[PDB]
């Protein structure tokens, strides 16, 4: 097992009452597969990834990434944030160079100038290697954030909702920039995606969670589709119809009712 | 016809001399009590076309013929819902709706108007956010109030420029069903703009698409054969639903290839 979360929760001590944002979740992640998290606003799934990455304090439990507890955020659980997490006063190449030359203070500049090229050009970022994060489009600056996260060879690439504020044209294109990129690196990926038809396309084991005063893994619905995917015959497969209907059936009828 | 958009074309005289042209030929026969949606490749021009009906823009060639008459200037009988939150931060929720009612109910009775706005902020939802400043409301809550303002006007038309752009596709899913409840009973004739196919095959009674490029045609005016009392939790089970949803995806794919050709014409 490349990761384990078992018997962990979190309670916020407040003067208005002890609030539990996460109730004894339990899951395992295999080496070399995606995992996606679903849930309405307040479902606590965003809180969950903050806990694994170390941004929070695991209470009444602890993660066991690679048989060891999570100590602090580091360059092995690099997490792609919301708001594009891009420094606006550094050009793209130096912005990526920030990560590479942050936990590798052992190799000379010779390797640093070349390692970035492999992990920056392979994601379709070579013409804009000197642009600043002021003219880059929103859907285009997420391709440097992903490049930064995978440039340090992370063990688990946690993804907060990356494409939560993008457009359909670019949103569809980005996924093809993850499967091929992830296939070469075979690095476990945990992602939060509110948009069904995106979990059903990328994820290998969708784990939707319930809403309310507490939270817990409602279902572990798994995708049996061929690992290679084209998004042209996936719809044409009848298995995808009832499969997606189950998600919508078990994401609006019960569990979460935001309204 | 309740609306007779015909030969509505718009050409932009770019100062550099390019003279950009967007709309070439558009035909519509929007009837009474019919919901219509504009689905495009985000470059064909949908906000501009909607603006023509809204009146904020004037067609260079031809013109709209709403209810067998020409539209000259924006009117409060064609209230719209903009993409950016069109709320006034210095007025509370119950006061924002009062902004539009005063400009249509110019007279009547003030005592009556208080009841009208109260009932028009409940069916849409809320009922608790009333008297809450529109600066701490949820992102998806700042939009349902905007829809309340337009319906409170009691208009003959209700344009919806894509509102669900800043909303993740879980509050949007929770908000589309709300429109069903609203339009099941009241007389509504929306013309809404979106680029996500799920709502096109869900709220619309006759989805109209648009071809990408400076030659934006009417595409194919597809019709959705589903019973009016729609519900997302049963409509999806309709066998014809998924059949049509592929069709729109099929058409959009063709324009995606065409957009590459448009770039290839100048870039490659």
């Amino acid at each position: 097992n490349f990761l384990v979360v078992e018997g962990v929760s979190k309670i916020y001590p407040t003067p208005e009452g002890p609030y539990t944002v996460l109730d004894g979740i339990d899951l395992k992640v295999r080496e070399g597969e995606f995992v996606c998290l679903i849930g309405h606003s307040g479902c606590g799934k965003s809180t969950l990834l903050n806990m694994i990455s170390g941004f929070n304090t695991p209470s009444e439990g602890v993660v066991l990434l690679q048989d060891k507890p999570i100590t602090e955020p580091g360059p092995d659980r690099m997490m792609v944030f919301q708001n594009y997490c891009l420094l606006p006063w550094l050009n793209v190449f130096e912005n990526v160079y920030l990560a590479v030359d942050a936990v590798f203070p052992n190799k000379p500049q010779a390797e640093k100038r070349a390692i970035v090229r492999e992990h920056l050009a392979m994601v379709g970022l070579t013409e804009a290697a000197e642009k600043k994060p002021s003219q880059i489009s929103g859907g285009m600056k997420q391709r440097v954030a992903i490049a930064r996260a995978l440039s340090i060879r992370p063990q688990v690439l946690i993804l907060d909702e990356p494409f939560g504020a993008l457009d359909a044209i670019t949103k569809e294109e980005l996924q093809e920039e993850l499967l091929q990129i992830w296939s070469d690196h075979q690095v476990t990926v945990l992602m939060i995606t509110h948009d069904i038809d995106e979990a059903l396309f990328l994820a290998d084991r969708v784990v939707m969670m319930t809403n309310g005063p507490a939270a817990q893994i409602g279902e572990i619905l798994d995708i049996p589709f061929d690992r290679p995917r084209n998004r042209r015959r996936i719809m044409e497969d009848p298995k995808y119809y009832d499969l997606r209907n189950y998600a919508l059936d078990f994401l609006f009828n019960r569990f979460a009712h935001n309204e | 016809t309740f609306v007779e958009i015909d030969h509505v074309d718009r050409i932009f005289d770019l100062p550099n001399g390019g003279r950009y042209i967007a709309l070439k030929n558009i035909e519509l026969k929007i009837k009474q009590g019919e919901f219509v949606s504009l689905i495009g490749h985000s470059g064909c021009g949908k906000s501009t076309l909607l603006n023509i009906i809204a009146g904020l823009d004037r067609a260079s060639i031809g013109g709209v013929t709403l209810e067998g008459r020409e539209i000259r200037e924006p009117s409060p009988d064609r209230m719209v819902v903009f993409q950016n939150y069109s709320l006034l931060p210095w007025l509370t929720v119950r006061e924002n709706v009062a902004l539009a009612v005063d400009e249509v109910y110019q007279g009547k009775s003030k005592g009556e108007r208080r009841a009208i706005i109260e009932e028009h902020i409940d069916m849409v939802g809320l009922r608790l956010a009333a008297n809450k400043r529109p600066s701490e409301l949820s992102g998806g809550m700042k939009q349902r109030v905007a829809i309340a303002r337009a319906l409170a006007t009691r208009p003959k038309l209700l344009l919806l420029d894509e509102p669900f752009g800043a909303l993740d596709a879980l509050t949007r899913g929770s908000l589309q069903e709300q429109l069903m409840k609203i339009c099941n009973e009241h007389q509504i004739t929306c013309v809404m703009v979106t680029h996500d196919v799920d709502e096109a095959l869900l709220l619309s009674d006759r989805v109209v698409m648009l071809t990408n490029g400076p030659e934006a045609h009417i595409g194919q005016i597809l019709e959705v054969p589903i019973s009016r009392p729609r519900q997302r939790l049963e409509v999806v089970k309709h066998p014809s639903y998924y059949n049509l949803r592929n069709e729109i995806i099929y058409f959009l794919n063709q324009q995606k290839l065409a957009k590459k050709r448009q770039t290839q014409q100048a870039s490659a």
Partner: protein
């Protein structure tokens, strides 16, 4: 109960100790023979009864404490700077609604803006030729552009969202004026009006050092020239009375601004 033990040790204890050590180090400074400034013990003890304890002791043509003097250079910021806000916004709004006037008189109301408040005195005082009106005029000229250049900029920064929801409605005229434009400029009036007071009080406490009269400026600089025993003691006291009365004019607008701001 929730603030005496917890809130107390971040807002009243840290400053007092920080201020206490500042006074102590100041006390140590006067130990130097060549440090002309008297120590805090001298400046706070040898001038205790005349001024601090009993203000309002008029004893001559110009003999007052830090009272009838603070409320003599502050009364010129009420009589003045009140015509600079009433006649500073209406001209600030009349100019700006049409982006044609605010294209010709922008590089005039901006060059004059960066003119020191106290440089208007020689010509202002050479026209009125009186001590009181000439001082009020400097206030009326020093703080308009900080209001005019903010109200005008505020009007032109009306978001297109508010206009669009106004055009779609049949709203235009006086009705369009008190609901969509002016209330959207109040946030920018109080961020310039705040600059006004503070940049006007600056002018009336410095422009009063030259024209004489009654009020700080005729007290903070009327004893430095006349050297006497413990002369500097009553200058530092004014420098403390100033800077806190001038602090309860930037917070006052800040307090009022937060009560009417558009949020």
């Amino acid at each position: 109960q929730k603030a005496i033990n917890n809130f107390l040790w971040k807002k009243v204890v840290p400053p007092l100790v920080a201020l206490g050590i500042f006074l102590v180090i100041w006390q140590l400074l006067c130990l130097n023979p060549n440090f002309k400034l008297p120590g805090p013990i001298e400046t706070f003890s040898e001038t205790w009864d005349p001024f601090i304890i009993n203000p309002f002791f008029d004893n001559g043509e110009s003999d007052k404490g830090l009272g009838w003097q603070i409320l003599s250079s502050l009364g010129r910021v009420g009589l003045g700077f009140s015509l600079a806000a009433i006649a500073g916004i209406i001209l600030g709004i009349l100019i700006g609604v049409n982006p044609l006037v605010y294209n010709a008189v922008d590089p005039i109301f901006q060059v004059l803006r960066t003119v020191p408040p106290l440089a208007w005195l020689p010509i202002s005082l050479a026209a009125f030729q009186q001590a009181n009106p000439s001082a009020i005029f400097v206030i009326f000229i020093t703080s308009i552009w900080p209001i005019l250049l903010n109200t005008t900029v505020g009007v032109q920064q009306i978001p297109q969202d508010y206009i669009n929801v106004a055009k779609v409605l049949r709203l235009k005229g006086v009705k369009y004026f008190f609901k969509i434009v002016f209330p959207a400029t109040v946030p920018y009036i109080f961020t310039g009006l705040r600059i006004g007071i503070g940049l006007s009080w600056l002018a009336i406490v410095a422009a009063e050092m030259l024209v004489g009269g009654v009020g700080i400026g005729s007290f903070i600089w009327d004893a430095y020239n006349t050297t006497t025993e413990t002369n500097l003691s009553e200058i530092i006291l004014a420098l403390i009375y100033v800077g806190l009365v001038g602090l309860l004019l930037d917070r006052l607008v800040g307090f009022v601004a937060s009560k009417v701001v558009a949020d």
